[PDB]
Structure 1
Amino acid sequence: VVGGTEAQRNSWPSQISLQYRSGSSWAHTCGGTLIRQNWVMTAAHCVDRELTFRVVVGEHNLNQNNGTEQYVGVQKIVVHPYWNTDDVAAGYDIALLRLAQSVTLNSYVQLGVLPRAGTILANNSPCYITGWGLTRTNGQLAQTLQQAYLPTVDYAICSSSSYWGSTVKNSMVCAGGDGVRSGCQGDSGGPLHCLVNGQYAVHGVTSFVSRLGCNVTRKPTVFTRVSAYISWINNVIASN
């Protein structure tokens, strides 16, 4: 997250860190959302590589023990069957991870609330992105979880020529684009949290930013629209 602030430790308890095994070590690579005690929602592109992945729930500081972390292996990966890694602009950038164990819920670990199917946010709706991604273009991962206020940019503006044009689809949500605040690498797969009727729900799965940079004016961060995928998610969980 570029232009973020440090989140409080219990603000976003559905946020997870997706990590891969790297020699003797684990490395953060992506965000996700805990949506069942044994299921995580992330981006398909996050699991393109044939790696050993684990999920950390209750994480805050990636390089310090917080005393609240639970570490759980990924046992099964279900990628959206229409996802194409060499065509992120087509969409379908979504994947479900079944965990080897069910995690325990507490003030640091909770299920994300998903919007109702078909829900479309009005332009300029209030949302926050969260994650441990780069804090500058071509920078480095955050140590502690960051958040940034990213209001939505509706499809008619986002698919306009000076924004993303044909690259953005209605199966996506755009947010931000102010040139200062943005998602960045390492935030991919995590949540976009939007306040509706008093309650935060996870409306987006972070998918992509501009090849020119993370915080580019009129290139808002682009998210998979969760409310396009409610039946897909339910079908996968029901079948696994």
Structure 2
Amino acid sequence: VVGGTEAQRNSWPSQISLQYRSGSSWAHTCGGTLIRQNWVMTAAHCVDRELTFRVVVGEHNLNQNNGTEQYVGVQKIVVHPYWNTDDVAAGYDIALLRLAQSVTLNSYVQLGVLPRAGTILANNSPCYITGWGLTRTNGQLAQTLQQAYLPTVDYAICSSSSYWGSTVKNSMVCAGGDGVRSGCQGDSGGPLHCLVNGQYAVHGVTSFVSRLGCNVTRKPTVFTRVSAYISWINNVIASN
């Protein structure tokens, strides 16, 4: 997150870190949302490589023992059947990870609340992006979970030429674009938390930014609109 602030330790407890076994270490690659004690929603792009993946729930500081962490194997990965690796702009940037164990819910580890199917937000809707990804374009990962206020930019504005044009579909959410605050490499797969009837719900899954750079004026961070996927999501869960 570019232009963030250090989150309080307990503000976002459906945040996970998506990690890969890197030599004899584990490295942070992505974000996620714990949506069941045994199911994590992430980007398809985050599980494109054939790597060994684990999830960490209760994470605050990537480099230090918080005493809250739970470390869990990925058992199964189901990417959306229309995801294409070479077309992120075609959307379907969603995966559902079944973990090896169920996690224990406490004040640090809670389920994300997902939108009702088909819910769109009004432009300029109040939303936060969370993550441990780069804190500058071409910069470095954060050690602590950062959060940025990133209002939504409605489709009609977002899909306009001056914004993203046709790169953005209506199965996506666009949020931000101020030139100062954004998602960046490493936040991908994570939550866009939006305040709806007094409750934060996960409306985004962080998918992409502009190749010019992460914080670019009139290039919002682009998210997979979760509310376009709720039957899919429940259909995977019911059946696996």
**Would the TM-score normalized by the shorter structure come out above 0.5?**
yes
Cα separation, 2, equivalents of 1:156 and 1:14: 30
- Cα deviation for residue 29 of structure 1 reads 0.1
Structure 1 gap ranges (5+)? none
SS in 1 for 2:218: coil
- Cα deviation for residue 116 of structure 1 reads 0.1
SS in 2 for 1:21: strand
SS in 1 for 2:212: coil
**Once superposed, which parts of structure 1, at least 4 consecutive aligned residues long, lie more than 2 Å away?**
none
The number of residue pairs the alignment matches comes to: 240
Q: Deviations over 1:23-71 (max 9, x none)?
A: 1100000000000000000000000000000000000000000000000
Q: Deviations over 1:60-101 (max 9, x none)?
A: 000000000000000000000000010000000000000000
Counterpart position of 1:120: 120
Counterpart position of 2:36: 36
Report whether the alignment pairs 1:175 with 2:151.
no
Q: Deviations over 1:134-179 (max 9, x none)?
A: 0000000000000000000000000000100000000000000000
- Cα deviation for residue 197 of structure 1 reads 0.4
- Cα deviation for residue 213 of structure 1 reads 0.2
- Cα deviation for residue 114 of structure 1 reads 0.1
Cα separation, 2, equivalents of 1:34 and 1:104: 11
- Cα deviation for residue 111 of structure 1 reads 0.2
Cα separation, 1, equivalents of 2:78 and 2:147: 28
- Cα deviation for residue 200 of structure 1 reads 0.1
Q: For 1:54-203, what aligned pairs fall within 5 Å after superposition?
A: 54-203=54-203
- Cα deviation for residue 107 of structure 1 reads 0.2
Q: Deviations over 1:2-30 (max 9, x none)?
A: 00000000000000000000111000000
Cα separation, 1, equivalents of 2:174 and 2:96: 22
Cα separation, 2, equivalents of 1:143 and 1:76: 28
Counterpart position of 1:215: 215
SS in 1 for 2:157: helix
- Cα deviation for residue 124 of structure 1 reads 0.2
Cα separation, 2, equivalents of 1:72 and 1:12: 18
> What RMSD, in angstroms, separates the aligned Cα atoms of the two structures?
0.2
Cα separation, 2, equivalents of 1:147 and 1:83: 28
- Cα deviation for residue 128 of structure 1 reads 0.1
SS in 1 for 2:125: coil
Cα separation, 1, equivalents of 2:120 and 2:66: 37
SS in 1 for 2:76: strand
Cα separation, 2, equivalents of 1:49 and 1:24: 18
Cα separation, 1, equivalents of 2:23 and 2:71: 17
- Cα deviation for residue 127 of structure 1 reads 0.1
Q: Deviations over 1:98-142 (max 9, x none)?
A: 000000000000000001000000000000000000000000000
Cα separation, 2, equivalents of 1:85 and 1:204: 19
Cα separation, 1, equivalents of 2:158 and 2:37: 35
- Cα deviation for residue 188 of structure 1 reads 0.1
